[PDB]
Amino acid sequence: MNLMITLLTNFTLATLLVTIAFWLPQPFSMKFFLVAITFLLFDLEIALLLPLPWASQTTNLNTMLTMALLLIFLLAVSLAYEWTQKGLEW
Amino acid sequence: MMTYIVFILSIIFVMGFVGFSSKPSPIYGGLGLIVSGGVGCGIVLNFGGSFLGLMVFLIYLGGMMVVFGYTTAMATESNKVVLGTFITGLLMEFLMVYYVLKDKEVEIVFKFNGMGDWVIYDTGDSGFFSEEAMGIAALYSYGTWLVIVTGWSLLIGVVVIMEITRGN
Amino acid sequence: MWFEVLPGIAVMGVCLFIPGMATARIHRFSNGGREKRVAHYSYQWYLMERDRRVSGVNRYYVSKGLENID
Amino acid sequence: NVWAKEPVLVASFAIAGLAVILPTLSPYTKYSLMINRATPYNYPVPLRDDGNMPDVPSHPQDPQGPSLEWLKRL
Amino acid sequence: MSLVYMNIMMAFTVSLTGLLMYRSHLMSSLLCLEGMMLSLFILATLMILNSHFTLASMMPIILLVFAACEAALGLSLLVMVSNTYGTDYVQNLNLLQC
Amino acid sequence: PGIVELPSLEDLKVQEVKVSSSVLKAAAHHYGAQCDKPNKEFMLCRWEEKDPRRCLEEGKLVNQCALEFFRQIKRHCAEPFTEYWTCIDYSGLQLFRRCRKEQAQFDKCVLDKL
Amino acid sequence: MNPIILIIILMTVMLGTIIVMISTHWLLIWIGFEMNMLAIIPIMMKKHNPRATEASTKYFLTQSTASMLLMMAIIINLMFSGQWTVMKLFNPMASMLMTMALAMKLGMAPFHFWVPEVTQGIPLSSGLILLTWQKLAPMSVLYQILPSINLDLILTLSILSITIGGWGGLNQTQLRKIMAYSSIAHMGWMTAVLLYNPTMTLLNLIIYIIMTSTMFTLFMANSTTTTLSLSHTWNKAPIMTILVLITLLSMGGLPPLSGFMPKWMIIQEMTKNDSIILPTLMAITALLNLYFYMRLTYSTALTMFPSTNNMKMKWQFPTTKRMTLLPTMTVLSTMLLPLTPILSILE
Amino acid sequence: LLQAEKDRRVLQMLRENLEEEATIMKDVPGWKVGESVFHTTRWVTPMMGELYGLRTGEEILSSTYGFIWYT
Amino acid sequence: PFFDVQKKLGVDLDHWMTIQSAEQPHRIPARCHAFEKEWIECAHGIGSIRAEKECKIEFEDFRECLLRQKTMKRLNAIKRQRDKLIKEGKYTPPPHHSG
Amino acid sequence: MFMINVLTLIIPILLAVAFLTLVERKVLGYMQFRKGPNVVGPYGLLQPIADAIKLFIKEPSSISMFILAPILALTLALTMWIPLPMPYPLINMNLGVLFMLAMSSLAVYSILWSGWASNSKYALIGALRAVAQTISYEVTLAIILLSVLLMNGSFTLSTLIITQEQVWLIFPAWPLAMMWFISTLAETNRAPFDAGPFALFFMAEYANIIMMNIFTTTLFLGAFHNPYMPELYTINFTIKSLLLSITFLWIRASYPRFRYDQLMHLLWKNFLPLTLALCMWHVSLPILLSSIPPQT
Structure with missing residues (x-):
């Protein structure tokens, strides 16, 4: 509820700023x-790799070493x- | 402002799936699916919840709808049927909420105990290593076969994609 | 030279200094002078929870030390 | 030659080759395994005493059993 | 059962109906398949977390990386169709008749 | 199905260590060596029988051991042990590397006097 | 394409089927089906006509929704009794959706509309690999989950598959839709036996795969799409005629010929139960699907159509493909009546 | 030490809530009074609704969901 | 069908993913460990049908561990009777914090 | 009081952005050859305050998409200084670097939505290429972030600010850090690496810039953390973040924009093997130096 309140305050202040930004004219x-x-x-493959640490x-350790090198090598x-x-020409 | 925040977020989740199941323009669909994935990530991060929904938040809401909006923008670009199905889906949502609240149980083909439920839940037990994070910290000691076939299917997906999109 | 650019840089350096210093000020102010705890794990949550239980005041910073002995 | 055309490719193959070959031979991997093994997450259990076995030291200051000592001893 | 599980399955079956009946574009159909992927993900994840079944926690992340590459194959096919025609309608598929 | 049976309320009044958690971490190791010869009996009961309502009397025994230990450390050296645990108290998640010199002071206290 | 790339992709189709056959964990089964789909798409669209694009699109949509419905069945199974053992399910709902996942997978009459569409718009090699392997591998899944099936599922899907695959086929003059209708007919024969004695079903699987490999090699003798092209195969070669005769009547299943061993033993260890009305109805519709085999036979190998010059120009040249394995599969697919005591080779 | 205090506290809440299950249904028909659901008399760990019932908001929120959106 | 290469090559490379009561990575159990162990040791060397005849009790016990649906049923009945009695007028509530 | 923490977090960043505009204009002038702004207001501070006021005054799609692009961009700009440990971070997230990546992806969404609602094919293909070169560097950013925290154990980032007391982490991975800094240049969409309300869009851009500056300063270096006096740490941290932001200006004002195909060719065939080889070296090597970091 801490970060829910912070998230909601970010949303409300951003909407306040948008409404001030909008309303003042009005092959x-x-x-x-x-x-x-x-x-x-x-x-x-990033999503596989990143829980490594x-x-x-x-x-x-040897198995983790070998399969980690397998993942980056692939x-x-x-x-x-x-x-x-x-594959990426232009 | 009350206890049943899991049920509340699940109501917003069903709202989002209805909101793009009514077949809009596909970028309205992408907006609704982003909102759906965000509150699903909120739900799983409310069931503790440390890692795994936020992990996939990068992927499902960081690496999928980008590509959908990309291939929608470079492919192609109000009506009574869409708005009518949305209102009737909302009505079925309203009716199921009512039968959860002012009854005892709800059956589609099950029995669901109709009340907001923190139960079941852990009894404050000593983990000290954040159980799901160490679960994801498997696949790299015991996971011999699984990441082998997974990376292999990734490599085959690569060559398949380029061949179908005109190898070479 | 830079003789007229250090005003803006100094004011903006104060304006970046202020949220961390204000946050540390409020962390000390809102704990009776202590530091806020950081329970990454459920074990430190349980330890903090029995701490706020045995204070009696539903406020763990008091920490009632060596006084409910006998 | 082999270097001027793709220099970063050669440097990448070089550091990758040492990052493959060097984990074979090292005087430190046994230390990595022992440090990684000897850090007790869970609780080391007490047991019903013995069938009169010359192991399992009773006091936690009794020096019979297995010990980690080389953290202080480099 | 619970309360949350009924709502996630209701969301699943509504996503399934949106997958099956679909009117004009195919991008929205593949996007509803992505939503069904999300539903299966969230369902299996909350199951495994509430069980504290820490061992096979591989299921949600590997489910999603695989159904992700399924969606990648699908986007390749849909862009192939939209290349060889003007749009990506369910029309232009009217040839190769039964 | 069969109904459960528990010990009533008059079995569960045993006086408990109503001290905080920071001090309870601060005096950890010497509690681990001086007492805790009979708590492993409690732990063995708890693992060999995963049924509390069977092993609680050893819980009472370790309760009175820990209470005797804190009585012994209160009514003797050290009084700057109180300064020691309130020094580790305000250091966030607790580290033994931060407030270290007072730990050596408390150790010199306990090695000289006791 | 490169031949390197195709040997890799065929190795992965094999790898997907071996993972499905080999595992004891439900996620491995789902990954096997998915990997089989992923690799089997670029065997199609070996050419680049819009026919293959639309056919692979239809196949992809039906196959992917079948795979996600299978994952739904697994997740229901673990919402209930929670373990990853490939065994008896613990919900009739989970078994229901799982059988409907396979019924979308390999083609049954509620779910079969994609099969003739996808088999027409592709070359014959892609059709060969899809029919043989994609109808081999999920039968292993059914053989592993046989003790927890509501029989009304397999009964309804099987009967309806036999009669739909029968009645479709009286109108189609295209060869590939004929072969796909024959496929749905044998899926009915290979599925209705399953809750009684599955050794029959697996032997029927081996029989059907050998028959269909013979048939597609004979239609790769030269690239033929209608029946008229087969009349010209008469005019250019005499022995392809008699082999189309023998293998078409063995697809029909007459007792002197080896296509009768699937019907015969299945009726036997079907009616050592006391289902009799269901076997005799199945055998009547088995009489029905033999008609389009018979009209193909009458079109080419028995009558002789008028033909075309430049076949004079074709007489000089050899039909110089390599037939992949033609003679072994021919006389092992047709003369194998007196070895029905090789039923019990299986378990 | 904490495990001993936790045993005594969860037994305390179980005794409290079974006493109040005996009270709160004092006249209902059917209804045996102390039904364990299971068939084996072992030690179930309860599911944090019988440890925490009839509390109305404060301790149930600040003792189940408090940690997750805390920190 | 199904082959047993998993058995003949001996390395149970997939039988670790499968159930509980194995090497969970740091040795903790799940919530319903002992129920699974009891039901597996009920129906281990049994031919899967007299298992259904004589392991029904522990399997229902396991499902009641995992779902706890009947325990929630009793709990909800208690709470709704609590609501009707506190609406009707017996003990404006003391059953928490003031016994 | 927690609401006061919220307001002191998310309000002074806007003044930070406005004074960043004056600082970058002034210092880029003194680079180039220009005093100014020094006329409107003493030494040019009333000049950016009047810039924001005048841009609010003026009188300029699918109002759904037309409003949902800048609202999302600026709520990212607000939410994305949550776990940065200016010594006590506002929320002690047990994992926050993955949150950094996810919100970079949400910024990609914002640019794509504004490009779709722009509804003109030249702006559409321009926004499309900008989405592709925004997304083309979140690979490298992720993998370098992975390798730099593998040296430090956990996602928590407070353990990171513990571990950088001994050495500045710029030393034990310098080329990896340099490639991460070039990818920050790519993600910020500035030189060399390249309709309204432009105040909001502009604002979100510069807040993302200062976020990457602060995250660079925290991820790689820092100062020794004084017990019970974090003011000195905050001072030296802020001065380092400002010197890196001036260095970011210093790189801005001297190089032309790349050609787009040169940008992609450079990324894939020049970062992507080199990042992979450095990352596998940081995988295989701490197991070889008897040194795996303690995830607690």
């Missing part, structure tokens, strides 16, 4: 699309595949 490109899906897939204290390999296959 495409295919290359656009690949950027979005490239972001979407690398952002999903919570995990970084285990007793099976991310770089997908980058390498679109790199060799001219």
Whole structure:
């Protein structure tokens, strides 16, 4: 309720400022699309990666090391595949 | 200003899903789905709630509706049916709220105890390591097979996307 | 030179200084002089909760130390 | 040659190659494992005493059992 | 059961009806599939948190990354349709008749 | 189904350590060594039988042990132990590295006198 | 495409089916179905006509809503009795939505409209892989969840699938819609036995897959879409005629021929129950679907149509594909009547 | 030490609330008076509605949901 | 069908995700641990149908652990009778903080 | 009193933004060659107050979309100084860096909505490309943030401000920090990396800028935290944030805008292998130096 109250105050002051700001007068490109899906897939691999530092204290350090390097290596390999296959040209 | 804030936020959640299930213009739909995902994240962050909804808040509300609005803006661009279905969905919401409140139980095909419920809930037990965060801090010791097939399906999704969008 | 730009920079440096200093002022003012607790985990929440229970005044900062012994 | 055309690519492969190869050989991974093992999250249980076993020290100052000591001893 | 579970399932089935019956565009249909993804996510997450079933906490995040790449495949297909025609209507699919 | 049985109210009046939490963390270790020879009996009862309403008498025994321990530390050295726990008291989430010199003072107290 | 890329994608379709066959955890089943979908889309649209774009669009929408409905069934299962063991469910509602998820998955008569549409608008290789593997893998799921099925589900979906896949097929002159209607007919035969003795269903699965592989290799003898093209296959080659004859009547299932082993043993260990009206109705509709097989036979291998010059020009050249595995599957799909005691090879 | 105090407090609230379940339904028909729902007499941990009932707002909000939107 | 490569290769690489009563990552249980352990040890070496004949009691006990629906039913009946008696006029409430 | 905490948090940031406008105009003049503004008002402070007043006076879609773009931009600008530990942060979020990423994504939403409601195809394709180059750097920002807190254990960021007492964290990852700072330049939408109410839109932009400056100063360096006297820490922290903001001006006033395809080509094929290699080195290496940080 602390941060709910703060969030609500931000919303109310922003609406107050908007109402003061308002009341006082009164074909495409295919290359656009690949950027979005490239972001979407690398952002999903981000979503897998980023809870790593919570995990970084285990007793099976070798397994965590190997699968962590597997994840980043696959991310770089997908980058390498679109790199060799001219995936972001312009 | 009272106890049943989970039920209240769940009412706003059902409001949002109805508000884009009435098939609007798709950017009105994207607005409604952003509001729906925000209050669902609020709900899960109210059931404690430390991590996982906020984790997906980046992804589902940080990496999905952006791409939907993107591909809506570069594809294409009031009516009685949309507004009528919205009002009737709101009416079914109103009727289900009424049968929760002024009765004992509600059955669709279940039995739901009709009262706002903090129950069930933890009895203040000593975690000290924030249980769901260490649950997500699995997949990296025990999770051998799962991240292997997950990253593999990610790589196959990459090559599939580029091939369908004209490899090469 | 910079002889007429340090007024604006100084005033804006005060205007960035003020919320942290006011927040620390209010954190000390609203605890009887203590520091506000920070329970990241449920264990520190339970410890803080029994602390505010045994103060009697529903206010944990009092902390009733070594006086309800015997 | 190999360096002038794509320099940051070579530097990235170099630091990636050492970040793969170097976790094999190190004099410190056993220390990482022992430090990571010996930090008790949960509660180490008391047990019904023994079948007259020459282990499980009774007093928490009795030096029979397993001990972490090299934190002070580097 | 509870009170929250009935409302989340009601939201799910309304999202399912919005997925099934759909009038003019396909983007709104795939977007309702995304909403159904959200509903399954929230449902499984609140189940696992209320159980304190800490072990298989993989379910919600891996469910969502996978149904996310499902939506990525869908957006690729929809943009392919809108390339090879003018719009993304349910019309222009009237050929290849049964 | 079968109905439960509990001990009544006249079994659950045992005088409790009505001290705060900051001091209770501040005197942790020497409580862990001086007393707490019989609390592991309570812990063994609690793990081998996960039924409170069976093990509570060992809870009474550890209650009176801890009360005797705080009696012993109150009526003797140290009085600047009170300054020690109120020094660790205002330091947010509690660290043992911040208010350290008074911890060494309290330790010199307890090693000399007791 | 690259051949590297296709060997990777076929490896992933195989990987999805092996994960579905192999696991004891419901999330792995769902990921298997999804990965199978994800990889099976670019086997379609090997060309780039709008036919394949629309067909893959329809297949994607139906398949993805089936997968999300399956995940709904799993989540209901764990709202109830909570464990990830692939076994008996604990809700008739969960079993209901799960059977309807599979009925949208592999094609049953309420849910079957996408199958002829998607099989016409693609080349034959994509149709081959989709029919064979996409109808192989969810039968494993049914074999794992057989003890907790309301039989009215499988009964209704099975009977209705047999009769719809029968009655569709009298009008279609396109080869691929004929083959998809035959597919729904065998899905009815492969599903109605399931709550009685599933060894029958898995043997029927192996039979149907071998038959349909023979059929698509014979329609890859040259790229044919109507029946008229098969009359020209008569004029250019004599032995493709007699193999279309034998394999079409084995799809029909006559007792001297190996397509009768699915009907025969299933009627046997169906009526060692006392369902009799249901088997005899199923066998009457099995008589019905043989008609379009028979009119294809009458069109090409038995009568002879008028034909066209430049087939004179085609006489010189070899039909020099490699047939992938034609002869083994032919005489293993047709002459395998006297080995019905290889039923019990299975378990 | 805290575990012993927590045992005594939860047994105290259970005794209070079963005494008041015996009072609050003093004349209703049917109704055995102390029905555990289960079939095995073990120690259930209750579900924070029997630990905290009839409190009207203050302790239930500031003792269940207080931590989550606190800090 | 279903194969047993999970069994023959021996490494139970998926039987850790499956149920409770395993290596939860730091050794804590769930809420309904002992119910699951009792029901599993009820129906372990049993042929899944006389399990349904003779493990019904503990399985209902487990479902009442997980859902606690009957306990909520009793609790709601208590609260609605509390409401009707406090509306009708017996003990303007002392049952909290003043016994 | 908590409402007074709220008002002292979210009101003086607007005065901070206005005086940032005067500071950036003055210092960019003294870079270029310009006194000014020094005429209206003593040394130019009444001049920005009058700037905001005059822009409020003037008399200038789908009023739904037309209002919901700047309302979201400015409520992001308000909400996004919640967990920044000016020593006592306003809400002690147990995880806040993921909240930083999520609200950057919400800013992407705001720009896309205003571009859709602009309703003219040249502004539409311009806003589309700006969305793509805003979203193209939240990858790198996320992964560098991951590697810099992996050296420090937990998402809490108060543990981070503990751990930067010994060394400034700019030393044990300098190229990683440099690449994060270039990505902050990209996310702020300024040079080199590139209709109303412009007051609100402008305001949200500059508040996001000062947020990234303060988050840079907290994430990478700082001062020693005095027990029971945080005023000295606040002073040295604020002066470091201001020197980095002047450095941000100093980078502004000297470089041309990139070509857009050069920007994307540079991001992918120049940051993205180098960030990945540095991040896998910060994965594999603290397990090799006997040093994994204590998540508490």
